[PDB]
Symmetry: C4
């Protein structure tokens, strides 16, 4: 039993050591490359303009190779855990092995972040030397894409570890613990990936300082591209984490603990999307302060606006998906953990609305920094219209999620009353009051849709921004009023019940 845990501990220690040695090998090769570049700095314009691009290309190739080595190390660690699980029938050693393997994959993603940071700081030391700016930006984007690929591979290995633990586990007290531990590890991986992407965006922001109008615009374009792919990694980590929590719930893992795990996952990923908003806003600030035009200025500002639009949409989508998972788990849960899950869903949706509002403040700050820098006016108006439309979309989706939570909680109240052997006429009265809840909820949803339609009509027509802000304030008042009324009606249904 414990001897298998010690053998896996030794193998994971050796894999951590080889990962550290591979990072040192990357640093050595990057140092050699930088020394060659510095030696060539003294010894034509075309010579430098060509060799610096070749050197950044082979340096990104070296980073991609070290990412491949680290991913192979991760797969071998997963295979080691697979060996250990087979070699063990006990639960204590199994849980200890999963904890140790999650720690190791955390350290491995940390080494990968250090390798990415080395590649980007070397690209900076190269731009010091006078290399290209479009080529440097492209090499940086390739670095970030290989890093995001490593993040996805680690997420899949974490999902496979969760699946092995589910398959070779017969208890709930421990299986839900493994669920929450795997979820903590996935949030850690996505935080490290978002940190890598934020560092790469800051590097592009320090690159655009010495670039031509068009070259700076291309740099901003592919910096928003790397932010888009980091967002894709965040969404994929969320989906895999939620798959893991669904598997355990399916296997009987504690209900309230899985609810707390999904809440913590939603919180961590909303913080990740917030830090990506922050990175995009810093990039937009630098672009506006260096782009130096009247047309490409507004073009880069509008492109950052599309990135923030996608950030808002992904915030809303992750909030809706976690609210729906909590709704299913509520459907399965209990008399009182169901109300705890409804309260937790309300918490997650309040957090998502707050972060969507912070994203709107970020986009408004970017559009004001584009106004003060004197950009195109049509582009700025279109960006403001797009943010009004996107904020309305987030209000719509979060309201739909809250209504779905209220419906699921009412259905759980009814399921509890039916299980507790109440009267038939009484249960008919409860099911008709729940039908009332659903009718008024559908009506509220379509009323929200109608008011959103009116706002979008005025927006595409080209209304003033102050006007749309007041109209959106009205829509928010209406949606909050309708949620409060629907909650009051559901509570009166519950009171009629008991």
């Amino acid at each position: 039993s414990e001897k298998a845990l010690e053998i896996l501990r030794e193998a994971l220690k050796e894999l951590e050591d080889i990962a550290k040695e591979q990072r040192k090998i990357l640093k050595d090769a990057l140092d050699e490359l930088r020394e060659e570049a510095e030696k060539l700095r003294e010894d034509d314009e075309e010579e430098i303009n060509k060799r610096l691009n070749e050197l950044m290309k082979i340096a990104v190739e070296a980073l991609e190779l070290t990412i491949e080595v680290l991913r192979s190390l991760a797969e071998s660690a997963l295979r080691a855990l697979e060996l250990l699980l087979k070699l063990a029938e006990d639960h204590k050693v199994i849980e200890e092995a999963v904890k140790l393997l999650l720690e190791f994959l955390k350290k491995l993603a940390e080494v990968a972040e250090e390798a990415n940071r080395l590649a980007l700081e070397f690209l900076e030391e190269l731009i010091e030397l006078g290399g290209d700016v479009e080529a440097a930006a492209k090499a940086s984007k390739e670095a970030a894409r290989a890093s995001a690929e490593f993040a996805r591979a680690i997420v899949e290995i974490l999902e496979e570890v969760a699946r092995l633990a589910i398959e070779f586990i017969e208890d709930e007290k421990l299986l839900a613990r493994i669920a929450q531990l795997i979820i903590k590890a996935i949030t850690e991986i996505v935080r490290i990936m978002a940190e890598m992407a934020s560092l790469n965006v800051k590097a592009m922001s320090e690159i655009i300082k010495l670039a031509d109008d068009e070259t700076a615009k291309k740099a901003v374009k592919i910096a928003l591209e790397i932010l888009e792919m980091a967002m894709k990694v965040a969404e994929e980590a969320n989906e895999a984490a939620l798959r893991v929590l669904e598997l355990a719930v399916k296997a009987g893992g504690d209900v309230e603990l899985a609810a707390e795990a999904s809440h913590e996952l939603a919180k961590a990923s909303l913080e990740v999307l917030k830090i990506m908003v922050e990175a995009a806003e810093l990039l937009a600030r630098a672009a506006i302060e260096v782009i130096e035009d009247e047309k490409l200025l507004a073009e880069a500002a509008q492109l950052v606006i599309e990135a923030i639009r996608r950030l808002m949409e992904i915030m809303a989508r992750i909030a809706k998906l976690n609210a729906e998972f909590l709704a299913r788990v509520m459907k399965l849960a209990d008399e009182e953990t169901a109300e705890r899950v409804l309260e937790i869903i309300t918490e997650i949706l309040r957090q998502a609305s707050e972060l969507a509002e912070e994203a709107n403040k970020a986009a408004e700050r970017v559009l004001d920094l584009a106004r003060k820098a004197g950009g195109d006016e049509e582009l700025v108006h279109t960006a403001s219209s797009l943010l009004i439309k996107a904020s309305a979309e987030v209000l719509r989706i979060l309201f739909e999620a809250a209504v779905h939570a209220i419906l699921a909680f009412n259905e759980v109240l009814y399921r509890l009353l039916k299980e507790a052997g109440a009267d038939e006429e009484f249960l008919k009265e409860i099911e008709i009051k729940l039908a009332e809840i659903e009718m008024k909820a559908l009506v509220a949803k379509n009323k929200l849709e109608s008011i959103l339609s009116a706002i979008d009509m005025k927006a595409k027509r080209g209304a003033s921004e102050e006007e749309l802000k007041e109209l959106l304030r009205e829509l928010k008042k209406t949606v909050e009023d309708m949620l409060r009324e629907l909650e009051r009606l559901s509570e009166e249904s519950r009171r009629i019940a008991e």
Copy 2:
């Protein structure tokens, strides 16, 4: 029981209210757009020529959006009925709920027609201002296409309501009532859609007044296009209505009542195709009186002729399809409701032949208005040849339907005699006389095909129109004589039977 009916009544009242409020929102936004256009009328030629097109584009976007809101309201009303059906085991409340929901979907399609009328009257107020004519026609066609999409969505929701009523219903007296009520609602929807399309064609007819020869021809082209898509909606409404009547017949719904429902459906849809013929004829009159050419005149006249050809063909197809459904239901029916169904089929085919003849009179009026306005002669001859061919095609198809009705009635007489335990030699004599009926029917069909072939030969060769009219009179005499003879032979078979 009744409480669920009242809850659904309240939800449908609120959905009717939100639909009315959405129509008011559309009117408000259209008023704002029209005021902006009028304010710009006073304040370049390019400025106006561009902004008026942008304004018509965003106004049609507003109409498309209000159609989307109304369709979402329809889906939510269907979901409300789904809730109510589940919440009810009683038949009276179920039937009352279906009646109320059909009334609501009638009012919803009415609101959609009002929204379409607003969009078209606004496009007219815009052409008053001097916008484009091709762009105005394209915006009008987009409006009509979104309206036809709403009509199809309502038809599918009606079919889903009929299917829910079929699934949650255990009786024939009431289930056939719901069948005929859903069919009345589908005829109402298709009448409203045809009215929207006729109004849009009249709007295009009032547009072509101030358009260039080619611009007027493009306007006429896409007005016939909107008539084609309204015809497609009529055919789809027929197919869905017939699917609904087949489902109930399958479930045991009264036979003679389903026959009366299919007869009324055929009658209403033939009136719809008649009003579309009328709209196409008015459009052709206006085009000929404004196109002002010798080549594009005949081109627009020939295009209206192709539209009338398609109208004739769809009249014939709907008549054949309803005659075939009545033939199947006859196959299932009875001793005497079978003869009632044969009489009703004769009525439907007489009505279809009368409306095909009225369509031929419409096309002849259009070709005479093209002759008097001095158009191309080859195009007019080709149009007359196409109408002779299409009228012959309708005669062929309606005759095939009548023969199929006679065959089905004879088969029902034989099935009745076999069920009533008659002799074996006697039943053999009856089945051989029915084989006689079928032999002479096949011969009659191929004789009609041969005479039609001779007419088409003379037509493609380029015969005179008076000549083809006399030859078509001869073909009609022959087909009526053969139908009378086949009916007499079948009646003599029935007399030999009893």
Copy 3:
């Protein structure tokens, strides 16, 4: 019983009457077209050059339409027989009905041949007037293609009648009679189709008289195209006839009678391919005597050579397929009908070899008429090489068929000895002598392949024609010697048996 036969007789009489009336309608319309053309002959060069082509196009449209009417009549007659078969349990009336329906489809294909002859004689009366030659040839090819389509439709209706007779029949004495009657009808249909194609080729041969070098070459090209599609109809009629004979054999139809039916089918289709060879040779004679060149002369001669190559190949393929069917039926047959089937297969292969040799004489006559008219020499050498290769291919295939017949007869002798309860050691000696037969047969086949390879090597190298004729004489001597030896070895095996 007999009353159903009389009712079908009446329906078929009426369908024959309507077919005759449709032929009269075609003659009337063609007469009207020819009168219009003659009236225009007196009343520009472009006027005539355009209107004559339009008139031939609409005349071929009239022919295609009359073919459609005749095919619909055929389908209705099949449906009448279907009614009659259902209406009858007796065998005598069923057989009489099938005989009458085959007679009717014979008369229908005869009317179709008369219609084709009318269309082609009208195209001739038009070329008298001075129409195009390429357009006239294209209209003639379209006429022949519609006629071949009618021939295929009739073949499929004959196959369907054979299948109905098989399905509704319980005896062998009569079922094999119906098999041989359907086969006679299919041979009649393919003879009529080949006659239509030969008449069309003769019409093209009388057209090329007044055509330009290139126009005459195009006429010859598409005349060989119509011969190719008539060959396709012959092959398809063979395949459908053989499918019919296989079905009956499967159903227990007399074995020796099915063998005689396949022999007669092979004989008739070999005569059909012979008459197509004759038509191609007449076309080549006319082309060579009118093409009047040194390059296009040899081009048309080489194209006729490719047509004759395809004729040889299809002769060989039909012979092989019928020999294989007889081999299967032998496998099923008997002690002595098996030897009768082996003798009949020898007869069919002798007939196929004789007709392949006649095809070679036809191609040699064509190449001599191209030599005497002074054509290109490379093309003539390539044509002679292609005929040597094709004659060698036919020798190979027919020898393979004869060897397959000998193998099947030996296998039947062994099956008979095993069924008749002979000794085990004795049956082992017989099966090893049959293995000897198969070994030496495989060796003979590959020796034939090797000698054919040597001839083809010398041919592609460009050997003299007299030389290849002597080498082919040697290959024929070798194949006949090996067949005689293999037959002697099989007969000695049979003698060792008994």
Copy 4:
């Protein structure tokens, strides 16, 4: 029994005779072609330049035809064996028949090699006459491709014979004998095919002597192409031979004998890949000594380097595949034949490493002959980098195979201990020590991957060749040390066991 063996002996003697006669026919036709060419040599420049190419084309057509005849002979011999197997229940005659048929297919491939040699010597006698060089090279490549197609057809016939013997055989002592005999025959076929390809490469090497720089480069290109397709035939022969050995093992064929058969197969195919390396090196020597340039010289040298890269890769792949087969058969084998199989795998991997090192020496000799002849420097550096990468790849793959062998042997030791009914705690200790073996093996594999990654990083960066040679020496030291340590750990596990 024996009589069937004698009948098959007679048929195979006749097929050998016809093959010999076909070779004589090819020689006769080639002699005639060469005489025509010599006669034309005396009797324009364009005349010769065209007719010599036409003559080489038709000569390669003659060779392709003789290959087709020989393949048909092979198929007929397979069919003869199929007859004989059916005709025999005894094992002695069956084995004698398979031995005789393998001898015959050996003689047939020998005749095919003689035909290929005749075609190539005739192409040489033609280049004596002054034909093209690109066309001669293309004709030679077509000859070699048809020869490789014949080699593949023979390999498939050998696999089919092995499958027939497996299907109609009930014993292991004899079935494993047939397995090893079929494997010897497949090694013989692949040796003959490699000899044909080496002769063709030598012919191209004697062709490039009188070719233009670009023409010589094209000749070298397609000579390496024929070497590539001969390598493909070697790999396919290996795969089919291994399929055959797997089938017998599946059927119960002796285990240790199948291991010896796979070892001998691997040895023979490694010798084949060695002789292909030798042919490529001779071709590169001739090219460098005749190409006479500074750019195309290095281009041809780099192309030979890619061919040697593919040779190294295929050596490694065949070694890995045979080691994996021996690992499976070990998994099935025994207590001591398992250690014999581990020793044999060590032998095969030592042989594969030695031949990969010889391939590296060949490529280094080619690059030194390109350095001394003064070629491009970038191309030579890229070739040296490619060989360092390929040698590292072969080290990686062979080490993976050796580790897989050690894992399989440990698993067999554990399976033996579990079968021999040892204690449960004892078996748990053994399975945890085997888990130790697997952990340290995974760590060793990823350490090898990391060091290989560092070498490839330095290589793509453009390190010096002496430097990479020392780094590769270090990687080899590390891999040998890790294999020795893993073997010592496994042996200590086995000692703890017993």
